[PDB]
């Protein structure tokens, strides 16, 4: 029997190779295989400005992220389910990870907050919505996503040691509630996976408390929450240094909302397996391209006659055809094609970064790759 | 009082300067002034592939052409009138010339033909339509066009001396009928103009017979028909040599469906004041650009790194920004913007040709311009 004819497991994480704290391997799921370390582009509605799903796939993405908060405001979770689920809605038939909605409640919406959950006003039309461990898992079930995030409590940066601890403890009680809600639905529990989220801010003892609590409940994967919220890379790396080793070794480790290319490399050096970020898309819409020599602003006059591709080594479809000069022309003209090409290149560049990370770990030369990568990225000889 | 506040005449042709048989001047109409010699781009439906009317105007066009045959098949003349007329339909508030429909009947449609008129089947849906001097003028009235073409009979190329003569005589009887139908409608006769069409193929005596007949009826302008239908430039110029002097000197002379840039220059040398052609649009959609060094095929590999504009001297909006290299990229990608840019440039190049013709006649150096133009256009040092 071929691989195509073979039964696919619900969730199987295998580690193929290690170098220090870094790992490379695969997550097998029913909708496909995810190569790790993995970068997940953030999915959106299919507007004139969004890439086609076949384009996103061709950049190398194995899985994309859906924002539960935005999908529950428009067109709503029940509507997405009636349309066949999020995979049908987005035209993406591979795995999808959904966040819980809890972060955007804090950052974008808030009527009531308690141990029960939260009620909040749409930032769009003032309507009231409710989220809780139970409602968040139910909505992610309606979306049909493959990896479900537990609902937790975010504490804004920077947080009092007092605020850090009470928020982490509530998040751990909410993590058990998320577990039980997920397990209550046979359709979800047999076909999807559930990740828990470690909290504790910068405090090693709180982080250990959270890790032990999550490990006692048991999850398919573990995210490190509370980072990439304003703390700077130095602090972020310091927290990762002691937080990641606390999580179960044989499950994936997910750093949510990270990030810049150098953030990703250093986080993999510290044991992270999964990443998401809007940065390649946001940068692409704003005329900024990622390259191995650092970011470039394509509107700069120096690019108007530059016949080289955006990046000298990138093998994305954009760089195999389009010059800096012509992408500069399109962006300066306000032509949507310009932003589309930048965005495709940026997402593909992120995937090629992940592939170089995976390859170098497999070959036992990742520590040297990370050194070579930083020297060149920060030299900015673009 | 300013020019903007002053009464505009129905149709006033003034000749400002002459060099040999060539003339430059103006046609004043109620919807604006037409600089002559004039090139009229052919207008179409507002599809994703059509230029915006403000873009067509900005290329220098003072008047555009509407194809009566196509407009009467879709959406139909009565529909265009209900929508406010052709100017409202097309978003073009300056003068419009409509042809009679008779040429496309021959070339595209034919159920019945007699001295009465013709009945024919749509090449689209088989429906039956009728045209005659009277019906053609009525339809052009429904369209609201500013310059109306008499309905004549085309004889396909090459035509027997027998066919040439009977067709010209019928066309002259149909020219009187067109005159009387036009004059029957106060709204049309007070606000629009009517052109007659000389026929006679290559036979000088037939052409003189036609000219005398048209001059006896009396028209606001006179077209030279029966050319640009396969005869080649040598023959075309030979016929123009004796045909144009037969027409009234103090009225505009219109060569329908011409043509290539060198055709236009030589026809102005022979006394033609007005031109139309689909060539700038057809070429633009097919990846061909007109330049002072001859046409170029932008898909050619030699243009992939050429940072020069399409033409070295053209001051159209495309050439003030876009390189050959980037228009090559767009065309090779099948991006509609590529064809749009080529088409805008081609129409603007035609207008800049007409402006150089007008300027050189005014300065008494048109004969030298025509010599300089041919030497460079045919050398093809692009
Ligand atoms: Zn690229
Ligand atoms: Zn141009």
From Swiss-Prot, chains A, B:
Name what cofactor the protein needs. Answer: Zn(2+)
**What is the uppermost EC class here?**
transferase
Query: Is the Zinc keyword given for this protein?
Result: yes
**Pfam families on file:** TGT
What reactions does this protein catalyze?
Answer: 7-aminomethyl-7-carbaguanine + guanosine(34) in tRNA = 7-aminomethyl-7-carbaguanosine(34) in tRNA + guanine
- Tell me which Gene Ontology terms the entry assigns under biological process: queuosine biosynthetic process; tRNA wobble guanine modification; tRNA-guanine transglycosylation
Q: What residues make up the catalytic site?
A: 99 (proton acceptor), 276 (nucleophile)
Has the keyword Glycosyltransferase been applied to this entry? yes
Any one GO CC term of this protein is: cytosol
Xref: SUPFAM superfamilies: tRNA-guanine transglycosylase (SSF51713)
EC number in record = 2.4.2.29
Q: Which residues bind substrate?
A: 99-103, 152, 199, 226
Pathway connected to this protein: tRNA modification; tRNA-queuosine biosynthesis
Amino-acid positions noted as binding Zn(2+) in the UniProt annotation, renumbered to this chain: 314, 316, 319, 345
In terms of HAMAP family, this protein maps to: Q_tRNA_Tgt
Subunit record text: Homodimer. Within each dimer, one monomer is responsible for RNA recognition and catalysis, while the other monomer binds to the replacement base PreQ1.
> What family, per the record?
Belongs to the queuine tRNA-ribosyltransferase family.
Q: What is this protein called?
A: Queuine tRNA-ribosyltransferase
Chain's gene name:
tgt
């Amino acid at each position: 029997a071929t691989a195509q004819e073979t039964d696919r497991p619900r969730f199987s994480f295998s580690i193929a190779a290690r170098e220090g704290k870094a790992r490379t391997g695969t997550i097998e799921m029913k909708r496909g295989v995810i190569r790790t370390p993995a970068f997940m582009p953030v999915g959106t509605a299919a507007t004139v400005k969004a890439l086609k799903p076949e384009t996103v796939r061709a950049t190398g993405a194995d899985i994309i992220l859906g924002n539960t908060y935005h999908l529950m405001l428009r067109p709503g979770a029940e509507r997405i389910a009636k349309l066949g689920g999020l995979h049908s809605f987005m035209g993406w038939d591979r795995p999808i990870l959904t966040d819980s909605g809890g972060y955007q409640v804090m950052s974008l919406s808030l009527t009531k907050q308690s141990e029960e959950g939260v009620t909040f006003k749409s930032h769009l039309d003032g309507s009231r919505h409710m989220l809780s461990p139970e409602r968040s898992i139910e909505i992610q079930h309606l979306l049909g996503s493959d990896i479900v995030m537990a609902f937790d409590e975010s504490t804004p940066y920077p947080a009092t040691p007092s605020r850090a601890a009470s928020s982490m403890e509530r998040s751990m009680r909410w993590a058990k509630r998320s577990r039980d809600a997920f397990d209550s639905r046979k359709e979800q529990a047999e076909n999807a996976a559930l990740f828990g989220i470690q909290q504790g801010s910068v405090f090693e003892n709180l982080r250990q408390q959270s890790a032990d609590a999550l490990a006692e409940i048991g999850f398919d994967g573990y995210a490190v929450g509370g980072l990439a919220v304003g703390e700077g890379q130095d602090e972020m790396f310091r927290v990762l240094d002691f937080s990641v080793p606390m999580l179960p070794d044989d499950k994936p480790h997910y750093l949510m909302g990270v990030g810049k290319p150098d953030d990703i490399v250093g986080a993999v050096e510290r044991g992270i397996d999964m990443f998401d970020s809007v940065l390649p898309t946001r940068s692409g819409r704003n005329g900024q391209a990622f390259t191995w020599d650092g970011p470039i602003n394509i509107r700069n006059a120096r690019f108007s006659e530059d016949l080289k591709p955006l990046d000298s080594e990138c093998h994305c479809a954009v760089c195999q055809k389009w010059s800096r000069a012509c992408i500069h022309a399109l962006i300066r003209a306000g032509e949507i094609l310009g932003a589309m090409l930048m965005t495709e290149h940026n997402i593909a560049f992120y995937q090629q970064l992940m592939q170089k990370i995976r390859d170098s770990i497999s070959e036992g030369r990742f520590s040297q790759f990370a050194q070579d990568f930083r020297a060149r990225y920060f030299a900015r000889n673009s």
